[PDB]
Design a protein around this ligand. Sequence first.
Ligand SMILES: Nc1nc2c(ncn2[C@@H]2O[C@H](COP(=O)(O)OP(=O)(O)CP(=O)(O)O)[C@@H](O)[C@H]2O)c(=O)[nH]1
Ligand SMILES: [Mg+2]
Ligand code: NA
Ligand code: NA
Length: 414
Amino acid sequence: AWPKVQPEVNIGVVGHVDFGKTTLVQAITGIWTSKHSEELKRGMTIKLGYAETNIGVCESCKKPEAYVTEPSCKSCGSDDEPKFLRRISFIDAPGHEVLMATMLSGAALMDGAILVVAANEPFPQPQTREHFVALGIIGVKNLIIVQNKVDVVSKEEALSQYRQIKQFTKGTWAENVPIIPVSALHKINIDSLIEGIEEYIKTPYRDLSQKPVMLVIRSFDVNKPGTQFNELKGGVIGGSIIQGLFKVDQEIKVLPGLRVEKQGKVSYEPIFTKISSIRFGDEEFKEAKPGGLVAIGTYLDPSLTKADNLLGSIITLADAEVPVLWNIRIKYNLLERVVGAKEMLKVDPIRAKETLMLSVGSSTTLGIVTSVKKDEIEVELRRPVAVWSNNIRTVISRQIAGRWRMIGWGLVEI
Ligand SMILES: Nc1nc2c(ncn2[C@@H]2O[C@H](COP(=O)(O)OP(=O)(O)CP(=O)(O)O)[C@@H](O)[C@H]2O)c(=O)[nH]1
Ligand SMILES: [Mg+2]
Ligand code: NA
Ligand code: NA
């Protein structure tokens, strides 16, 4: 039989709106990531979606057909059980420009990524570029480019686009990134994509000597309505472990924590709690490691976790020393152009007193520029940000024409 383990690697699925990301994830895993009513109604990804699958290989069969997502080699004639390779999971990003920030949060959780371009659309589009550049900046460079919807066009049209993609990636970090043509909707050439995932998105080395840190993107509760108000199950916090590992019954804290109001005034206090359960999808475990999206059950009052209240938080061991900053210094670099914009546009230099948006881990925060130099800015934050390490990248956005657009990036200096 195949073992029941947690996913050991996270793969982002990103790209311009409507190019078929969620359908691609479904073609691979059998799962439709959209769980919210607004998503189903509007036919769009809004919150980060998630899906897992085992990956295995039929050792006596021919590739790529030998790659399977279930323990059966029948499809290639063998009666032998396929060799289990690993369990993987997908972080399904929204393509809509207005949801760029969400993509950025998701990118903090990715070990690698798939960029979806549509074969029946002109390359390249605004969020094709924006997501590409974001991936580069954040360091998600184990990339596969998927040419989706090939069922819609002839082979020569798809090839013409392929040439365009090669031209675009040339002279960049992605020059040798593979391009794999599929039909997500009708499930064509999906096995070449599995093969490509095994070849180009290896499970990263996980440094065990690192303190446990989890980035939070979800929070909620498994409390069915009508449940007795003093028999309620504790709050659940969802996210991804980016370093170290967590274990059931560990004492943890949520940083910055909860918003405290004294009269008018607003401060933040760390939320201390204990891990009551660890869950990956539908399976329970005794420990949680990087790779996958984990649901950490706690003893917290459900009202503290309801409706993704803790999005952007981090979780650490109770006694970890973690700076929670209302002011930050960033060693920065601006893009030449606002890549996410429909019309070509130059990036204006940072100006004192202007409001910027900062993506740090899974958090998104507005701040006012208090100092500008050539290589560094200092920012006064509207809400504090937990900074768990010395080498954390931030992505910098500016509001242009009422739209938050990525304009640069930097290192948060402590
Ligand atoms: N012909 C064809 N249509 C496809 C293919 N993949 C997806 N589509 C269609 O494109 C539309 C959008 O699919 P969806 O998977 O929601 O794309 P998405 O990129 O996740 C949308 P969002 O960016 O808002 O998250 C759907 O009508 C879907 O059936 C394909 O391989 N071929
Ligand atoms: Mg989608
Ligand atoms: Na599967
Ligand atoms: Na301050």
